[PDB]
Design a protein around this ligand. Structure first.
Ligand code: HEM
Ligand code: HEM
Ligand SMILES: C[C@H](O)[C@H](O)[C@H]1CNc2nc(N)[nH]c(=O)c2N1
Ligand SMILES: C[C@H](O)[C@H](O)[C@H]1CNc2nc(N)[nH]c(=O)c2N1
Ligand SMILES: CSCC(=N)NCCC[C@H](N)C(=O)O
Ligand SMILES: CSCC(=N)NCCC[C@H](N)C(=O)O
Ligand SMILES: [Zn+2]
Lengths: 411, 407
């Protein structure tokens, strides 16, 4: 069966046959759409099929399907599973795997880049210290002095779910949040709970508004340990505005490298609970969400004051006005410092081209509209006008619960 | 069975049970989400009738009463012999108010129970239709102090005797393609604008020409009519700081009145049922003015502001978009035409959601439509999980009449 998606601004229609190759469920039914819901120990039994599909995909992509190297590999994985209960991916399969997980990531607008991913195989890693070293190398390689390069680091896969590798941080670089007793927060509110954990594990907190948090790291199921990323490794951009000279006096900066560390990489049935990955920022991530969410740094007001806008009635659109300035400032700052960042117009347009090309070559491109559309200026980006089809392909990045909720402390 | 929706900005969690009374289908499956697609018999009718009347009688606290049962019999007998049935006025009104209540794409539902319903079921001609329409337009406009209203023409019968308003709204601007290849006026109405001319309309062929109404009664060929100009309240668009803004020559009309939908109540289809409320500022300023396939004016406004349009990374479109929208809200407010800005409206819709949750057990909502097409995440609705489902009575889309009507 074929499915059509139309762009309402250009009238381009597209035909999706790829949704056919999908099995994981959406959270949706014929009676309810959960399209806007944020979050809607494997047996040998169900492991070989998962293996087989993956290797069928892998071998098709290299144009070797049905070959002797394809069959021998099936038979070998098959044997290794019955014998050992799991199996190891060749290097080639891991690389292909991680590329495809990104490729299939429907909430990601930056996927035009999916085929350029530096994969770092950390499956020989055994300790937290080994983790730290692997991560530092990732952060230095990916930063590249501001000329950001996409990368992922993949630690050993889950075995009995009792020996998991986990990065307790939600990102490799992120600013502390500290709840004061008067109810206010100092620094990033997103990070207060994690910050407290760090502190409880013995981190001495500078307690400022932009303190880079320590890596908290779990190897082989052992309690995690704290480590400071070398400061010279953390590239940061002080935030100024091309015409508002008081803007710098707002005391703002951000880090240049976004690197998600809390998700799970599934490939051919295997689960990698530690697989930090990094690309680069679209400006709105920082200027709209990180700075302006009410539950984040929440700077709209103080920027509004400084611009002396009529703040007395919402219909002045003073909020909308401050938001654009703040976003001009973020992009201006990054560009001036020659740190890679992309604006939301350029990013969404690229993505439309990627999506169209994906339909023509692959028969589909699963996409989550709620996520692909930027959080300001929605309809003046071409994605707003693009119908999308959202479905679940593997390999994939999945959510997993916070490890402090699951972890069994050895003390 | 019972579903949770969470607001991520405030942490409030709501439990939806209303979805288990969902009837219609969504387009989605376990395997695919179609959340962002725009348009995903005697025996048939009695179930629908019964289900509507049960909720109507439960709403008036008379579920199961003799009054309830008798009406179920009376409607049942009428179907059994006539093959359709007629709604009591009280049922007509409740049905309409609830069709709005259930409209998951409408951010403005906090207003739902204050709807003036005009029963035009005794109408028989397009002249009759025009007269009902003008009285609608005048009542709802109210000299700028807009009031919500729907007018309901006679329900479909054999679907060869359909009443239809061919305009997509009562009031909208014309669209002419030109030898220039460009488009003058509203390019969204270009094709209708033709059908009108193909029907005799003398287009003044300018940029903001209020289209003629094109009305079809009892399935007949439809007929042109010019709304008395004095009935069309319009706003010239100026900016509270850019004096030059007025020079752009922009105006919009005060009354949005969706005229092409189909109202379904208790299994009965009312295919002409124009309804109207009032505008959220972004509809005009963001979509109508700046959609690249609408008036697409960002290019020219950016010029007047002398912004650096050299690179997309100056956010010049974003800068302009904001001003354009300050101007619209400003114009309407200055002239005392009712209008709501996207901040105040989404705040109200969050409050409506919470009312419906504790009062009705849920509130179907389509996040993709509810989140405004500017400043999404600074409106509270961005951070609100919504569950979308299809309850009845409802408004549905229906084919354009010209693709259908036989001459
Ligand atoms: C090349 C630069 C990239 C850009 C500009 C980009 C852009 C984005 C943005 C804006 C989001 C939404 C994030 C949010 O709102 O929190 C996102 C989500 C996501 N991106 Fe990309 N991305 C890039 C590279 C990558 C890479 C290298 C990966 C992994 C290999 C990736 C995988 C994902 C995933 C899995 C999500 C969804 C995260 C979630 O569900 O919370 N992206 N991306
Ligand atoms: C009273 C003030 C109202 C406000 C502020 C309001 C707001 C809105 C907005 C912003 C939309 C999205 C429209 C678009 O983007 O095209 C919408 C759609 C809709 N509204 Fe409301 N509305 C109001 C009154 C009404 C009334 C009186 C009704 C019917 C009785 C109604 C029913 C609907 C329906 C059915 C849709 C979806 C129509 C479609 O699919 O295009 N609204 N409304
Ligand atoms: C409830 C709602 O889905 C939630 O706020 C989503 C909406 N869209 C989003 N889109 C992106 N890119 N990132 C987000 O965090 C969110 N949040
Ligand atoms: C393809 C996508 O569904 C389409 O552009 C939608 C998105 N959200 C919308 N939201 C509103 N309120 N009105 C619209 O016309 C649209 N268009
Ligand atoms: C793998 S990096 C992909 C990206 N461009 N963003 C990811 C999420 C970052 C987050 N939104 C933030 O604002 O820090
Ligand atoms: C029934 S009135 C509800 C409303 N406020 N808008 C409806 C659609 C109008 C459209 N967005 C426009 O910009 O003309
Ligand atoms: Zn869905």
């Amino acid at each position: 069966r074929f499915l059509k998606v139309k762009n309402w601004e250009t009238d381009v229609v597209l035909t999706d046959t790829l949704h056919l190759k999908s099995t994981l469920e959406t959270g949706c039914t014929e009676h309810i759409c959960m399209g806007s819901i944020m979050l809607p120990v494997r047996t040998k039994d169900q492991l070989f099929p998962l293996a087989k599909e993956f290797l069928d995909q892998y071998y098709s992509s290299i144009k070797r399907f049905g070959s002797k190297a394809h069959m021998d590999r099936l038979e070998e994985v098959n044997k290794e599973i019955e014998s050992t209960s799991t199996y190891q991916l060749k290097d080639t399969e891991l690389i292909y795997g991680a590329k495809h997980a990104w490729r299939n990531a429907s909430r990601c607008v930056g996927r035009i880049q999916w085929s350029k991913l530096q994969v770092f195989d950390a499956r020989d890693c055994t300790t937290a210290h080994g983790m730290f070293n692997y991560i530092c190398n990732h952060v230095k390689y990916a930063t590249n002095k501001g000329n950001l390069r996409s990368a992922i680091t993949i630690f050993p896969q889950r075995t009995d779910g009792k020996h998991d590798f986990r990065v307790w941080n939600s990102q490799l670089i992120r600013y502390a949040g500290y709840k004061q007793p008067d109810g206010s927060t100092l620094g990033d509110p997103a990070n207060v709970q994690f910050t407290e954990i760090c502190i409880q594990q013995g981190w001495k907190a500078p307690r400022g508004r932009f303190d880079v948090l320590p890596l908290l790291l779990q190897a082989n199921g052992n309690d995690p340990e704290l480590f400071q990323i070398p400061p010279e490794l953390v590239l940061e951009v002080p935030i100024r505005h091309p015409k508002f000279d008081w803007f710098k006096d707002l005391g703002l900066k951000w880090y240049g490298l976004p690197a998600v560390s809390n998700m799970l990489l599934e490939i051919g049935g295997l689960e990698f609970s530690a697989c930090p990955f990094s690309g680069w920022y679209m400006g709105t991530e920082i200027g709209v969400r990180d700075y302006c969410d009410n539950s984040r740094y929440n700077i709209l007001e103080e920027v509004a004051k400084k611009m002396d806008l009529d703040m007395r009635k919402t219909s002045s659109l003073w909020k909308d006005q401050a938001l654009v300035e703040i976003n001009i400032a973020v992009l201006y700052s990054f560009q001036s410092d020659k740190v890679t960042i992309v604006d939301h117009h350029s990013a969404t347009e690229s993505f439309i081209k990627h999506m169209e090309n994906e339909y023509r070559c692959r028969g589909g491109c699963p996409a989550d509209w709620v996520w692909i559309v930027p959080p300001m200026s929605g309809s003046i980006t071409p994605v707003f006008h693009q119908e999308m089809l959202n479905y679940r392909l593997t390999p994939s990045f999945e959510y997993q619960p916070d490890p402090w909720n699951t972890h069994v402390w050895k003390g």
